[PDB]
């Protein structure tokens, strides 16, 4: 008799619309609390994400509210499209949880990274990541936090970006909850608070590509100290021109780290990491290495744009012809609720 029904999945209760049946947890990855389900109405398999009391703090609130707003005003095949948004709660007073529905994909990008991929597959994932990022950039969306965990793929190698990243005109805080923030794919400008342009997300596409070839996180670490050491340890200390654009403090710290000449890209990503059996693969390896060498550049002023990357011989083959201000818990609960209810 209720339009909704509850089911305990993993550890989390899922009060969902009776149309969604046979709810199996994804776990990895997922991300947050994400389910697989069969939509009776649409006759297709969907993925259901539960946002638990998202208005509980500024961090959770700003992200949920901005992603909901942006999921509506964005339309691309490599960007998250919502099939449904709902709340089981009947009033603004009763409101607790938000449920976002999208099509079911088959894996996240970390899983795909672990696999031995060919140049056909590899350049197709990379073309799509850049297509998505180009679309976000045109909508005035500079991600800054692109990572494989928030990227999903289908068996046919079709890719989608699930989030809209770092809140422009913010202003991040702490988390009283136990969850890891993946910083490994963030651009040096993010690592060193610098001010950015569109190609801040290219660094991210270079870390991912690098990991597809190496099968190891390129610049790991506990924090930006550990991390920055690995960036300069491999690509070498940035040129004096880069230092000039830094804040006086950042500049002082950066200039005072032991200097490194840096490894060359054939030594960073040797021939052994790539298929070599044919001439085709021999050519595709040097083309692959060239793209990386242009994406993994500390100084943004020198690092490759999204448009130039799509016209790179490795990628180009796939070409086919309000309101970041502070609010309260009550203020946020309303902004979010009247966006669910529209
Ligand atoms: C045919 C089929 C496919 C299955 N898929 C999986 O097991 C699987 C594994 C990892 C990731 C995903 N996947 C995850 C999402 N969505 C999200 O992670 N987050 C998200 C969800 C909804 C939103 F509105 C926004 C973000 C999609 N696919 C599915 C399982 C069984 N059969």
Coordinates of C-alpha atoms and ligand atoms in Angstrom, one line a residue:
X1 CA 0.0 0.0 0.0
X2 CA 3.1 2.3 0.4
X3 CA 4.8 3.6 -2.9
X4 CA 8.1 2.7 -1.1
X5 CA 9.6 -0.4 0.7
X6 CA 12.7 -0.9 2.8
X7 CA 15.5 -3.4 2.4
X8 CA 18.7 -3.8 4.5
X9 CA 21.7 -3.9 2.1
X10 CA 25.3 -4.3 3.3
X11 CA 24.6 -2.4 6.6
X12 CA 22.4 0.5 5.1
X13 CA 18.6 0.5 4.9
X14 CA 17.3 1.3 1.4
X15 CA 13.8 2.7 1.4
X16 CA 13.1 2.7 -2.4
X17 CA 10.2 3.1 -4.9
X18 CA 8.6 -0.3 -5.5
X19 CA 9.7 -0.1 -9.2
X20 CA 13.3 -1.0 -8.0
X21 CA 13.8 -4.8 -7.3
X22 CA 16.6 -7.3 -6.4
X23 CA 19.0 -4.8 -4.8
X24 CA 22.5 -6.1 -4.7
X25 CA 25.4 -4.0 -3.2
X26 CA 28.3 -3.0 -5.5
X27 CA 30.8 -2.2 -2.7
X28 CA 33.7 -1.6 -5.2
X29 CA 33.1 0.9 -6.5
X30 CA 31.0 2.6 -4.9
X31 CA 32.3 5.3 -3.6
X32 CA 29.4 5.8 -1.1
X33 CA 26.4 3.6 -0.5
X34 CA 25.6 2.3 -4.1
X35 CA 23.2 -0.6 -5.2
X36 CA 22.5 -2.5 -8.4
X37 CA 18.8 -2.9 -9.0
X38 CA 16.3 -3.9 -11.7
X39 CA 13.8 -1.1 -12.7
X40 CA 10.4 -2.7 -13.4
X41 CA 9.1 0.5 -15.1
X42 CA 12.1 1.0 -17.5
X43 CA 12.9 -2.8 -17.9
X44 CA 16.6 -2.1 -17.4
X45 CA 19.2 -2.4 -14.6
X46 CA 20.0 0.7 -12.6
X47 CA 22.5 1.9 -9.9
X48 CA 21.0 3.4 -6.7
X49 CA 23.1 5.7 -4.5
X50 CA 21.8 6.7 -1.1
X51 CA 22.8 10.2 0.3
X52 CA 22.3 9.8 4.2
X53 CA 21.1 13.1 5.9
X54 CA 23.3 15.1 3.4
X55 CA 22.5 18.4 5.2
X56 CA 24.4 17.2 8.4
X57 CA 27.4 19.5 7.7
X58 CA 28.7 22.2 5.2
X59 CA 31.0 19.8 3.4
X60 CA 28.3 17.1 2.7
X61 CA 25.7 19.8 2.0
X62 CA 27.6 22.0 -0.5
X63 CA 28.6 18.8 -2.5
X64 CA 25.1 17.2 -2.6
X65 CA 23.4 20.5 -3.4
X66 CA 25.9 21.5 -6.1
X67 CA 26.0 18.0 -7.7
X68 CA 22.1 17.8 -7.8
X69 CA 22.0 21.3 -9.5
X70 CA 24.8 20.4 -11.9
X71 CA 23.4 16.9 -12.8
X72 CA 20.3 18.7 -14.1
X73 CA 22.1 21.5 -16.1
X74 CA 24.7 19.1 -17.7
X75 CA 24.2 16.8 -20.7
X76 CA 27.0 14.6 -22.1
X77 CA 27.4 10.8 -22.8
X78 CA 30.6 10.8 -20.6
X79 CA 29.0 12.7 -17.7
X80 CA 26.5 11.4 -15.1
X81 CA 22.9 11.5 -16.3
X82 CA 20.2 11.0 -13.6
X83 CA 17.3 8.6 -14.4
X84 CA 15.5 9.6 -11.1
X85 CA 15.9 11.5 -7.8
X86 CA 13.7 10.8 -4.8
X87 CA 13.1 10.9 -1.1
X88 CA 10.9 8.4 0.9
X89 CA 10.1 11.3 3.4
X90 CA 6.8 13.2 2.9
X91 CA 7.6 16.6 4.4
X92 CA 10.6 19.0 4.7
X93 CA 10.4 18.3 8.5
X94 CA 10.6 14.5 8.0
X95 CA 13.3 14.7 5.2
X96 CA 16.5 12.6 5.9
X97 CA 17.8 10.8 2.8
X98 CA 18.2 11.5 -1.0
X99 CA 18.3 8.7 -3.7
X100 CA 20.0 9.2 -7.0
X101 CA 19.3 6.7 -9.8
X102 CA 21.5 6.2 -13.0
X103 CA 22.1 3.4 -15.5
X104 CA 24.1 0.4 -14.3
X105 CA 27.6 0.3 -15.4
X106 CA 29.9 -2.7 -15.1
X107 CA 33.0 -1.5 -13.3
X108 CA 34.9 1.5 -12.0
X109 CA 38.1 2.8 -13.7
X110 CA 40.5 1.3 -11.0
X111 CA 39.4 -2.1 -11.9
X112 CA 40.1 -1.3 -15.6
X113 CA 43.5 0.2 -14.7
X114 CA 44.6 -3.1 -13.1
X115 CA 44.0 -4.9 -16.5
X116 CA 46.5 -5.2 -19.4
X117 CA 44.7 -2.9 -22.0
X118 CA 45.5 -2.5 -25.7
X119 CA 46.1 0.9 -27.4
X120 CA 42.5 0.7 -29.0
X121 CA 40.9 0.4 -25.5
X122 CA 43.4 2.7 -23.7
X123 CA 43.1 5.6 -26.1
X124 CA 39.3 5.1 -26.2
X125 CA 38.9 5.5 -22.4
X126 CA 41.3 8.6 -22.6
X127 CA 39.4 10.2 -25.5
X128 CA 36.2 9.9 -23.5
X129 CA 37.7 11.3 -20.3
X130 CA 38.9 14.3 -22.3
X131 CA 35.4 14.6 -24.1
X132 CA 33.7 14.7 -20.7
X133 CA 36.3 17.2 -19.2
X134 CA 35.9 19.4 -22.4
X135 CA 32.1 19.5 -21.8
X136 CA 32.5 20.3 -18.1
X137 CA 35.0 23.1 -19.0
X138 CA 32.4 24.6 -21.4
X139 CA 29.7 24.6 -18.7
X140 CA 32.1 26.6 -16.5
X141 CA 33.0 23.4 -14.6
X142 CA 36.8 22.9 -13.8
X143 CA 36.8 19.6 -11.9
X144 CA 40.2 19.7 -10.1
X145 CA 39.5 16.4 -8.4
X146 CA 39.2 13.8 -11.3
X147 CA 40.2 10.3 -10.0
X148 CA 39.4 6.7 -11.3
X149 CA 37.2 5.8 -8.2
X150 CA 34.6 8.4 -9.4
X151 CA 34.8 7.1 -13.1
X152 CA 32.7 4.1 -14.3
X153 CA 32.9 1.9 -17.5
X154 CA 30.6 -0.4 -19.4
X155 CA 31.6 -3.7 -21.1
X156 CA 31.6 -1.9 -24.6
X157 CA 34.3 0.5 -23.0
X158 CA 31.9 3.5 -22.8
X159 CA 33.0 5.7 -19.9
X160 CA 31.2 8.2 -17.6
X161 CA 32.5 10.8 -15.0
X162 CA 30.3 10.6 -11.8
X163 CA 31.2 13.9 -10.0
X164 CA 31.8 17.6 -10.5
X165 CA 34.9 17.8 -8.2
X166 CA 36.3 20.6 -6.1
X167 CA 33.9 23.4 -5.1
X168 CA 35.0 26.6 -7.0
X169 CA 34.9 29.5 -4.4
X170 CA 35.5 27.1 -1.5
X171 CA 36.9 26.5 1.1
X172 CA 37.2 22.8 2.2
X173 CA 36.9 21.6 5.9
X174 CA 37.6 18.4 8.0
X175 CA 35.6 15.1 8.3
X176 CA 34.6 13.7 11.7
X177 CA 33.9 10.4 9.6
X178 CA 36.4 7.6 8.8
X179 CA 36.9 7.8 4.9
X180 CA 40.0 8.3 2.8
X181 CA 40.4 11.3 0.5
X182 CA 42.3 10.3 -2.7
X183 CA 44.8 13.1 -3.5
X184 CA 47.1 11.2 -5.8
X185 CA 45.5 12.6 -9.1
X186 CA 45.4 16.3 -8.1
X187 CA 47.4 18.8 -10.2
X188 CA 50.5 20.6 -8.7
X189 CA 48.4 23.8 -8.6
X190 CA 46.0 22.0 -6.3
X191 CA 48.8 20.5 -4.3
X192 CA 50.4 24.0 -3.9
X193 CA 47.3 26.3 -3.8
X194 CA 48.0 28.2 -7.0
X195 CA 45.0 29.3 -9.0
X196 CA 44.1 27.3 -12.1
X197 CA 42.9 27.1 -15.6
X198 CA 41.0 24.5 -17.6
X199 CA 44.1 22.1 -18.1
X200 CA 44.3 21.5 -14.3
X201 CA 42.3 18.3 -15.2
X202 CA 44.9 17.2 -17.8
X203 CA 47.3 16.5 -15.0
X204 CA 44.6 14.1 -13.7
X205 CA 44.2 12.3 -17.2
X206 CA 48.1 12.0 -17.2
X207 CA 48.1 10.3 -13.7
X208 CA 45.4 7.9 -14.9
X209 CA 47.1 7.1 -18.3
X210 CA 50.4 6.6 -16.5
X211 CA 48.7 4.2 -14.0
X212 CA 47.1 2.3 -17.0
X213 CA 50.7 1.7 -18.4
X214 CA 52.6 1.4 -15.0
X215 CA 49.8 -0.3 -12.8
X216 CA 51.1 1.8 -9.9
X217 CA 50.0 5.1 -8.4
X218 CA 52.4 7.6 -9.9
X219 CA 52.6 10.2 -7.1
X220 CA 51.5 8.4 -3.8
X221 CA 51.8 9.6 -0.2
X222 CA 50.2 10.4 3.2
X223 CA 49.8 14.1 2.3
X224 CA 51.0 16.8 -0.2
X225 CA 54.5 16.8 1.4
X226 CA 55.1 13.0 0.6
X227 CA 53.3 13.5 -2.8
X228 CA 55.2 16.6 -3.9
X229 CA 58.5 14.7 -3.2
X230 CA 57.4 12.0 -5.7
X231 CA 56.4 14.6 -8.4
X232 CA 59.8 16.3 -8.4
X233 CA 61.7 12.9 -7.8
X234 CA 60.3 11.7 -11.2
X235 CA 59.7 14.7 -13.4
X236 CA 62.4 16.8 -11.8
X237 CA 62.3 20.1 -9.9
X238 CA 60.2 22.7 -11.9
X239 CA 62.0 25.5 -13.7
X240 CA 62.6 29.0 -12.0
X241 CA 59.7 30.5 -14.1
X242 CA 57.2 28.2 -12.3
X243 CA 58.4 29.3 -8.8
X244 CA 57.7 33.0 -9.6
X245 CA 53.9 32.3 -9.8
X246 CA 53.9 30.8 -6.3
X247 CA 52.8 32.5 -3.0
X248 CA 55.9 33.7 -1.0
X249 CA 55.5 30.8 1.5
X250 CA 54.9 28.0 -1.0
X251 CA 57.8 29.4 -3.1
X252 CA 60.2 29.3 -0.1
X253 CA 59.2 25.6 0.8
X254 CA 59.3 24.4 -2.9
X255 CA 62.7 26.1 -3.6
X256 CA 64.2 24.6 -0.4
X257 CA 63.5 20.9 -1.2
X258 CA 66.5 18.8 -2.4
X259 CA 66.8 19.4 -6.1
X260 CA 66.2 16.6 -8.7
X261 CA 67.1 16.4 -12.4
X262 CA 64.2 14.0 -13.1
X263 CA 63.9 10.8 -15.1
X264 CA 63.2 11.0 -18.8
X265 CA 59.8 9.7 -20.1
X266 CA 61.4 6.6 -21.8
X267 CA 62.9 5.8 -18.4
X268 CA 59.6 6.7 -16.5
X269 CA 57.4 4.6 -19.0
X270 CA 59.8 2.1 -20.7
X271 CA 59.1 0.1 -23.9
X272 CA 58.6 -3.1 -21.7
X273 CA 55.3 -1.6 -20.2
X274 CA 53.8 -1.4 -23.8
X275 CA 52.9 -4.1 -26.4
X276 CA 55.8 -4.5 -28.8
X277 CA 54.9 -7.5 -31.0
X278 CA 54.0 -5.4 -34.1
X279 CA 54.9 -2.2 -35.9
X280 CA 51.4 -0.8 -35.0
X281 CA 52.0 -1.2 -31.3
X282 CA 55.7 0.0 -31.7
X283 CA 54.2 3.3 -33.2
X284 CA 51.3 3.5 -30.7
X285 CA 53.9 3.2 -27.7
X286 CA 55.9 6.3 -28.8
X287 CA 52.6 8.2 -29.5
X288 CA 51.4 7.1 -26.0
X289 CA 54.7 8.2 -24.3
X290 CA 54.6 11.5 -26.2
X291 CA 51.0 12.4 -24.9
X292 CA 52.0 11.5 -21.2
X293 CA 55.2 13.6 -21.5
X294 CA 53.0 16.6 -22.4
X295 CA 50.3 15.9 -19.7
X296 CA 52.7 15.2 -16.9
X297 CA 54.2 18.8 -16.9
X298 CA 54.3 20.6 -13.4
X299 CA 54.1 24.1 -15.0
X300 CA 50.5 24.5 -16.4
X301 CA 51.8 27.2 -18.8
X302 CA 53.7 24.4 -20.6
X303 CA 51.2 21.4 -20.0
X304 CA 48.9 20.4 -22.9
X305 CA 45.3 21.8 -23.2
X306 CA 42.1 19.6 -23.5
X307 CA 41.6 20.7 -27.3
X308 CA 45.3 19.9 -28.2
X309 CA 45.1 16.5 -26.4
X310 CA 42.0 15.6 -28.5
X311 CA 44.0 16.4 -31.7
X312 CA 47.0 14.3 -30.5
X313 CA 47.8 11.4 -32.9
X314 CA 47.2 8.9 -30.1
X315 CA 43.7 10.3 -29.1
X316 CA 42.5 12.0 -32.4
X317 CA 41.6 8.6 -34.1
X318 CA 38.4 8.4 -32.0
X319 CA 37.0 11.9 -33.1
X320 CA 33.5 11.4 -34.8
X321 CA 31.9 14.0 -37.2
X322 CA 25.1 30.2 -7.0
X323 CA 25.5 28.9 -4.2
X324 CA 28.9 28.3 -2.4
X325 CA 28.0 30.7 0.5
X326 CA 27.7 29.5 4.1
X327 CA 24.4 28.1 5.3
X328 CA 23.1 26.3 8.3
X329 CA 21.9 22.7 8.7
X330 CA 18.3 23.9 8.4
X331 CA 19.2 26.3 5.5
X332 CA 20.9 23.4 3.7
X333 CA 18.1 20.8 4.4
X334 CA 15.7 23.1 2.5
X335 CA 17.9 24.0 -0.4
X336 CA 18.5 20.2 -1.0
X337 CA 14.9 19.1 -0.4
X338 CA 13.4 21.7 -2.8
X339 CA 15.9 20.5 -5.4
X340 CA 14.8 16.7 -4.9
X341 CA 11.1 17.8 -5.1
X342 CA 11.9 20.6 -7.7
Ligands
LIG1 C1 25.3 -5.9 -15.7 C2 25.6 -5.8 -14.3 C3 26.6 -4.9 -13.9 C4 27.0 -4.8 -12.5 N1 27.8 -3.7 -12.2 C5 28.7 -3.7 -11.1 O1 28.9 -4.6 -10.3 C6 29.4 -2.4 -10.8 C7 30.7 -2.4 -10.3 C8 31.4 -1.2 -10.1 C9 30.7 0.0 -10.3 C10 29.4 0.0 -10.8 N2 28.7 1.2 -11.0 C11 28.6 2.1 -10.1 C12 27.7 3.1 -10.5 N3 27.3 4.3 -9.9 C13 28.0 4.8 -8.7 O2 29.0 4.3 -8.3 N4 27.7 6.0 -8.1 C14 26.5 6.8 -8.4 C15 25.3 6.1 -8.4 C16 24.2 6.8 -8.7 C17 24.2 8.1 -8.9 F1 23.1 8.7 -9.3 C18 25.4 8.9 -8.8 C19 26.6 8.2 -8.5 C20 27.2 2.6 -11.7 N5 27.8 1.4 -12.0 C21 28.8 -1.2 -11.0 C22 26.3 -5.6 -11.6 C23 25.3 -6.5 -12.1 N6 25.0 -6.6 -13.4

